[PDB]
Amino acid sequence: SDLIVKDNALMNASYNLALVEQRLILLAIIEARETGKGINANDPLTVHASSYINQFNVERHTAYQALKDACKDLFARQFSYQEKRERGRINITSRWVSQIGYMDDTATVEIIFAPAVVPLITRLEEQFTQY
Amino acid sequence: LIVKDNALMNASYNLALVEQRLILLAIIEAREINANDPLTVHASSYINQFNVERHTAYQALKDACKDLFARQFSYQEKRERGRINITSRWVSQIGYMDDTATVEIIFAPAVVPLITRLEEQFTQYDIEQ
């Protein structure tokens, strides 16, 4: 089925993300829930370096730069898969995120997930959660 | 501040003509637009509207899709506590269907609110055709 194919393609592509990129995504999910924001293809999601520090106990002075650099690395990625259309099958290429942003003065970044990824965000949360 | 409209319209000058026409055709066929739903462009529409070689027209659109997907533009916004530096794609997703000679794009959310301005600029450029 289509959703199984896309899920498979995204999960296989997920292995290429660096740990900081996985944590950027996890943090966006966590902060969205915490501040009462849904995840969709239009609205930016904020990530605070302070949350990165609080969630993962990472070196504090490099946390914001790590997130800033992870945004750029994630923004460069793409994945491909096929979907059904009325008139046949379509060959799709998608980004992970359509937009990124950073605010140096507040140590925050912003991302918008691409629409193909939005329905699989809970699968990514599962894929990326470490115990 | 690097205002978004200025940055995007200046970035539009950098597109190849086929990419500009891909965007215009997507807008046209839609009328005949949001950050979630793909927009279809038929190579037959490209051929019918523009003075292009018909035998290579679909391939030209496929290549234009890939080039447009590779592009980015940047701008700034004022926020409460300071300035944010934003980088956006033109399209978040592309697709092609060889058997029907069609392509698909989804515009990135930063571009959606400027689509009418892009339509006007690209219509003015190609008004003779």
Author numbering:
A (entry chain A): 2 to 132
B (entry chain B): 4 to 35, 40 to 136
What do the authors report?
Typically, BMMFs encode an autonomous plasmid trans-acting replication initiator protein (Rep). Rep binds at an origin of replication on the DNA (termed ori) and in most cases comprises a set of repetitive DNA elements (termed iterons), which are present within most BMMFs. Reps are composed of two winged-helix domains (termed WH1 and WH2) that are essentially a fused N- and C-terminal protein. The Rep described in this study is encoded by the human bioactive bovine meat and milk factor MSBI1.176, which was isolated from a patient with multiple sclerosis.
In this study, we determined the X-ray crystal structure of MSBI1.176 WH1 in the dimeric form to 1.53 Å resolution. The asymmetric unit consisted of one WH1 dimer, i.e. two protomers (termed A and B). However, residues 36–39 could not be fitted into the B protomer owing to a lack of discernible electron density, although the electron density was distinct in the other protomer. The WH1 structure comprised five α-helices (α1–α5) and five β-strands (β1–β5) in each protomer. The A and B protomers were closely related (r.m.s.d. of 0.37 Å); however, a minor structural shift was observed at the β2–β3 hairpin, suggesting some flexibility of this region. Similar to that from RepA, the MSBI1.176 WH1 was also folded as the replication-inert dimer, while RepE (a WH1–2 construct) was crystallized in the monomeric initiator form. Superposition of MSBI1.176 WH1 and RepA WH1 showed that these two domains were structurally similar (r.m.s.d. of 1.20 Å), with both having the typical five α-helices and five β-strands. The MSBI1.176 WH1 hydrophobic pocket also contained three leucine residues, i.e. Leu11, Leu18 and Ile25, which were similarly positioned as in RepA. However, loop movements and different α-helices and β-strands have been observed among the different structures. In the case of MSBI1.176, the β2–β3 hairpin shifted approximately 23 Å when compared with the RepA β2–β3 hairpin. In the MSBI1.176 WH1 structure, six basic residues were also found in this region, i.e. Lys69, Lys73 (both located on α4), Lys85 (β2), Arg90 (β3), Arg78 and Arg96 (both on adjacent loops). The function of the MSBI1.176 WH1 β2–β3 sheet orientation is not obvious, although MSBI1.176 WH1 has a three-amino-acid insertion in the β2 strand that extended the sheet.
